[PDB]
Amino acid sequence: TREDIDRKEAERLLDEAFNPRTKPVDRKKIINSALKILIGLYKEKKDDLTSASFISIARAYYLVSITILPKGTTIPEKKKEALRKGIEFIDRAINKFLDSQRAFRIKSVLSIEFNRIDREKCDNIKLKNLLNEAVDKGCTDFDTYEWDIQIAIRLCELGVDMEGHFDNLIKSNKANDLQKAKAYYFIKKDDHKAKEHMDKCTASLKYTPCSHRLWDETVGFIERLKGDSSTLWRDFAIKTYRSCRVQEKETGTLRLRWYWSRHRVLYDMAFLAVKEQAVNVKQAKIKKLAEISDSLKSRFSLRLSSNHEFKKFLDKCVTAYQDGYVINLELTQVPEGWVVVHFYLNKLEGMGNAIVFDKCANSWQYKEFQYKELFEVFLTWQANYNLYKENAAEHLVTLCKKIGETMPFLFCDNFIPNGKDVLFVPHDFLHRLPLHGSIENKTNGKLFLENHSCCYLPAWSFASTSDEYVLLKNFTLQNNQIWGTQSVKDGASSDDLENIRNNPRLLTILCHGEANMSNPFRSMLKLANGGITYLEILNSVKGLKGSQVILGACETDLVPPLSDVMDEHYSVATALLLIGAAGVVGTMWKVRSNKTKSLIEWENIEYKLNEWQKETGGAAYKDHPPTFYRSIAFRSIGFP
């Protein structure tokens, strides 16, 4: 009939889409066209179609599902939609009926994918029952159908006995190394051959794009191994993390938001593996922990570091950040007397790490802490701040005290020696914490800054003449003769900041600021006319290379309290760091004018920020919480 020829054309289209020869961008379009043909046929025949036509509709829906790559955190709703619709249509095909075997094959693969993405809707026992139905209905043909291999591997992973099809599973040419390893591990328990096949898959991972479902499948395999208390999960996690590193080195900066940020649990798993493996060998393990921690920090920002083309790309990055549609130095290189505290908040476990390197002692050591209570207190501080800026100071102090309570090691002499300058490399919400102002949990406790002149760095990759000052006040010391020719005091002339040259040794942007928690790329320095923002800073201003920027603007270093898909800072101060600024004294929240001007008094570029903060009200946490809040807001960012 007409239905037969229509569905034959749709099946030809789906098969032409199935093979990897076709480009994915047109593969999606031709799968959608085949689905359009099939759905038009289904609508024109309403509820009485040939069973194989319903099976073809379900296969088209599954093929749509297989081409919907998951986003950074949330599974795309079209993926769940197509899986649900395919399952429903193949259920209609099963109720009224080597064709039943392929119907149950498509049903089982659809249900496998639905269980993988939405385990609650397709629970594991129901999936197991339907997988058994499929395998007793002939779903065993390997070396010709990769799907049968998928049912076989899922069945062996649910825990049923699958030793009979092992030989056919392995001899099949269309089985990837991960399915081979799962078969060798789950039914034959051949840990050596499972290790060999997993090593092969991990080596192949160095080239597969992060969008590939093989990444999620191998993360799930190693997760299952870790839950099984297997002895191979550590090496598998470490090697897969090395593969993720080399791959992320070559993915697009847009796909860092989308698909690389998916493999954060993989970095957590590798961190756990190295931590379990952790005298000299132990120190190398500690340094590898630091490397794993730093590899997750500010990767898309690191790629943010002619003009119109870069502006267009930055606009694309901003649209991708908002979940919109886009239209198309070693860690031991610290200078002497400086201690670097690398942080890492493991999300797979409930712990966070504080890998520290002491350069003078050349000593690596980490301490674990519970960041859940500290995170709740930090969110308390952020909510109270966004409601009441200067009246949340008390909470800030509490938060600071929490940093001294959840992290008492910050005040241990053996951890961070007293008097050693500290460079924090925080992770996740610790990026937004005043680690410089942390108060030790002792009677009359001292802040962290008092003992150590502590500066920050969003990631270790950020670490890397003119001798005049170019203050750009837009709010006395504006008439001081130390200000250079390019310095402006009446109108900020944001265009002049775009046109600042000669790599000044210092410049003060005395203006206002807005954090823009909704979109950190429009975090604005309220300069003249249109305020310059993170988007404009990354493109327009180019003079401040090697500069020592001082930011009197409010909320220069304020970020949305909630962590992004990946750990990056997205602040105005980080924006200026991205254009070559050697150091930034950006402000972490709203401040008064008196403290900013006092900062500018400290000419006197070589003077440490810590001496300031000690002198002017920093120690007065019990005396006056508001003066503490005004004091610590100026974190120091950069590397000497």
Place this chain on the structure above:
Amino acid sequence: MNITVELTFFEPYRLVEWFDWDARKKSHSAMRGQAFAQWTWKGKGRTAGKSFITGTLVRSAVIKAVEELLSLNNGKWEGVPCCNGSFQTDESKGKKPSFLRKRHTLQWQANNKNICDKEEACPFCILLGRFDNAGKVHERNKDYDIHFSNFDLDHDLRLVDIASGRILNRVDFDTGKAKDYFRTWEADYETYGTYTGRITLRNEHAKKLLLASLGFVDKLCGALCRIEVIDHNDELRKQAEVIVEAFKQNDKLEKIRILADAIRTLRLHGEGVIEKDELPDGKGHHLWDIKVQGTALRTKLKELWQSNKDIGWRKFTEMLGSNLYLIYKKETGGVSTRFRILGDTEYYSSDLFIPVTPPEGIETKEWIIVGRLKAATPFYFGVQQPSDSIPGKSLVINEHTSFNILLDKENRYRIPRSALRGALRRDLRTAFGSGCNVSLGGQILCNCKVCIEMRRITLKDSVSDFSEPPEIRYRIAKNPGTATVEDGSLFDIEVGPEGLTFPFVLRYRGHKFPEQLSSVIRYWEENDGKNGMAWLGGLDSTGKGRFALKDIKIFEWDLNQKINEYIKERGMRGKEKELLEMGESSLPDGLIPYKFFEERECLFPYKENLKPQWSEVQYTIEVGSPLLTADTISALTEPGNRDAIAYKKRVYNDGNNAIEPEPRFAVKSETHRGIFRTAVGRRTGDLGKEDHEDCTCDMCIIFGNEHESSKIRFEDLELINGNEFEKLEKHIDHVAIDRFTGGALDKAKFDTYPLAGSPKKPLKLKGRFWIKKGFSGDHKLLITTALSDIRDGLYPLGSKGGVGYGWVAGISIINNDYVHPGHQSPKQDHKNKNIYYPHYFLDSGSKVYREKDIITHEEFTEELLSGKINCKLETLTPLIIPDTSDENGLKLQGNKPGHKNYKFFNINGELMIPGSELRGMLRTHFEALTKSCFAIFGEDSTLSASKTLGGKLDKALHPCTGLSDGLCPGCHLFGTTDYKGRVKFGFAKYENGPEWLITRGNNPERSLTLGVLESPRPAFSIPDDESEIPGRKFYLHHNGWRIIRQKQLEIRETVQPERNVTTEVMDKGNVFSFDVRFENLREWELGLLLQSLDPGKNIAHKLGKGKPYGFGSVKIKIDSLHTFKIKRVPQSDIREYINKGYQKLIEWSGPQWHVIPHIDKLYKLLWVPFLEPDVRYPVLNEESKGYIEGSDYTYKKLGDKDNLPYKTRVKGLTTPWSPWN
């Protein structure tokens, strides 16, 4: 102790099916609706159930109100210092509560003397039930120090009676399109808005606080609330079946869709249209007089209404129209079903405690802005089909109305709280210039500015006090290639009237009234100079939903001081219309007017973000041509029997609180928007491409795609010249005339009712479009270019625009001397002794060239020149164009009853002829000249016998049916049903010359009485079935009008008054001027068009009534020709165009036009000897009136085969100017 609590809702509260707590996780719809009103089925079948409100939900609302109340009063109530309470159940201590808080908890400095325990606790802990016997698992009802029982609905109970299922939305701010959607059951808040429950309290110390909390619960179940303390369808379907079957019997099945549309629109007319028989009577009627089961359709509908009077007239009309539509769909190959393949995203959504501590002594207050949203434009609030809108219920059957406007349970228009809230959130995000795209199910609150405001803002679902049925806009999509309606592109949208005012409530609860919220409220206000800018609802791009928020009256509850009176008055929740309509003195105790509303220009976010957001460009189109935006569906319902009428809007007038008595004629905002979009996509070529995915064309950024909103929003082109015209709608008759038979085809006669636009009295249509902030200079210049293109008359507005309708006169923000030899017989017979036939035939040939490379309408191709010709009509003999709007225009029927007397065609008192007649004459001349098909042909008409008329005609000569086989040059240039014409003839306007022909014979001067005008008989032209069809019928240029003048009295006396007609007649030498626009026109095509206009110095055209009588022959003079890619083309290039058109004609055959014999025959048919040949029709016999003695020129002599052979007669009818005697 224990008290009965009544929870009254004041806007439609959300409802969801009750699920058990463990089973609730299975369904995400009930998982989300944990704060909704619960509904549990009372029996099998999923038909009837009971609606309740979970006592835990009322308890959560009450403890939230206690949190806010204590936070306002520095952590105290009535002098009793409470503690911060506990909202953290440790998992080791016990099981977590079923509902986990994901919001900031209002906290304060603890002033309690001792820690709270079982022995004694603060009223906050008592209201929490912190230290009672009852715990997280219910065992007994006596274990609760505070107990909130279930709240059963106070009024078995069917679900559809209480609730209506509705799809909500999550519209992306950047793209303007909804990311996803979800469905909830908005229950009736009028008949089922009251819920009774019980609250027991054995700890009287907290009692006062509890009662205060009951007064502080602003909203519950998704609705504002006060918490006080004590089947014709089957029969209609059968009748639809019988009606549709009877229509199918008369092969009028396709008319059933039109009938369903008319029946649905009858709901706007009320009962009287059927009971008083206000439907058009007919000249019977083509649709309302169709015989159904033995009776007329109108009488059948009257009987149906009498039988179905039980349901209201509105409901009866909608149900009958829907049933007729559904049955028609069933009989045409099944009813269309909708199925979103991939994107039907029905989406539904880290335990953490965040204590927020407001500073001690801070002042928090409530500003309740009350006003009226006036629909400055026809508003549309979308809703799904009624089948989808049934609670408790996979293809979905597409109902009659493609787009329904959301309505209240009593058919009143509704502005949802959700839609108005989303529009307010978008405007707030604009005002701040910084806001999030709403994240669903987030672990913590969005602390971005817009989210904080929205969490502090509570609106009210508003229902208009106007329940009359919606108006219907029948939007279509034009095919860019053929400029015709796209296949399958047709949809009726229910829009509410403009000017309809809804209540508007906006409660802000917070410390300081924001500059951005005040900026938004000033943005929405119309005030005096600006326009209201609340773009609520949908269809914003087509000017639907621009609401002016007028009658704004902000108030203020000083919550820190006036909390007791606020609780007493319940925040005036459900009493906001009182705040609108009560005096300043009669306010409640704690409510004071807010005198600190910042003015419009004193709000920086308004001036910087909101004011430049939408720039209004208002302009007035002056149209010197009749304007007709067709409303055929509405044309059928209201009387006059007009086939097509000008579109008119139903406009609400709150001054009289009713629809305006005279509807406002306008070019719909959809038509205006489509004209602009076509202009932009033609200048930029953006209309050319078929796919606009991942696409950034200028038209795509300006006008939006399937995935992005529009940066330009078009409003209606309202006619502001209604009072200027005495007869605003001019009845213009039209009829297709067979190319072979000079008669008026069969069924091709029709009429039109366009607005009386004339060059001297043009129509002024004032319309405006809004431009989004951030338009490129290139895009702004492109919009200006499109506006100027409209100004130059490139795109007429409305139907029949290519025939002389809706031509834009403006906006406000050369000769030929070709000599033709003629024919030997008239020139040689200088004595005028010869008598000729009044019409002859052109047998051009069997071969017709069809161009399958159809010229597109999607761009102005550079190789093809577009422009405008100005042509001078010169009448070398009296011309007759009757003003057939009034068949008694001359008012002489008193002397001669039954006589058809018409004035000359004229609009608004100035003398003109329709551009449709000019196009028809030029098209006949062009088809004959280019050997094109008989585009209009009476095939269905039968001839007296072996076969029909269509069989005799050649296959190649047949009218072009579809673009698949291509179109002939006549149908290529002038268009067909599938293809819009690329030539557009305007209404010729009289300029100078003798105004009228004056004949002393007629008692009414300047008028002339014609003879008998009877239908031509193909039997004379085709004497036998074997003989072929002669060809295209043409008439000669002769002075038979002089004969009519000398026999005026004889014609009047001998001919019956009803047999003939009298007309106002032109004189010799009258001059008209008409414009002829063309787009994407070939050089040879333009040359051929110019030649067909002005063929030569002696060749003239024939146009008007009385062509066989020698009337209505005109000379066209091209005095100017402008082209643009606007430069005036010199006569040299014009002659070059005509020469290459001659070359194309020669290539077709395989500048002296007589060389090719068929063109010579055509032009000698149009040759003007004036010489004075005598031409008149033969008489029947030797005894008939008007006979000349001693002449063989009679039809008896020319009818018999023996005396006049059939073949010789056929040859003579094919030979122009042939001597008949």
Place this chain on the structure above:
RNA sequence: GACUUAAUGUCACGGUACCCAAUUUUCUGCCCCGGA
């Protein structure tokens, strides 16, 4: 009473049925021979 609540934790007012579409395309108010 149950239907139908769990209680030291419900931002669903946490979510514009939104986005795209020209009621349009073709047509001269025109015209002569037969009927029993």
Place this chain on the structure above:
RNA sequence: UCCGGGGCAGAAAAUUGGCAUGG
């Protein structure tokens, strides 16, 4: 053996179809 006569007065098409989330 006969001396009149109107015609169409809308026909056909569409009546919904799509809605980019990874180069």
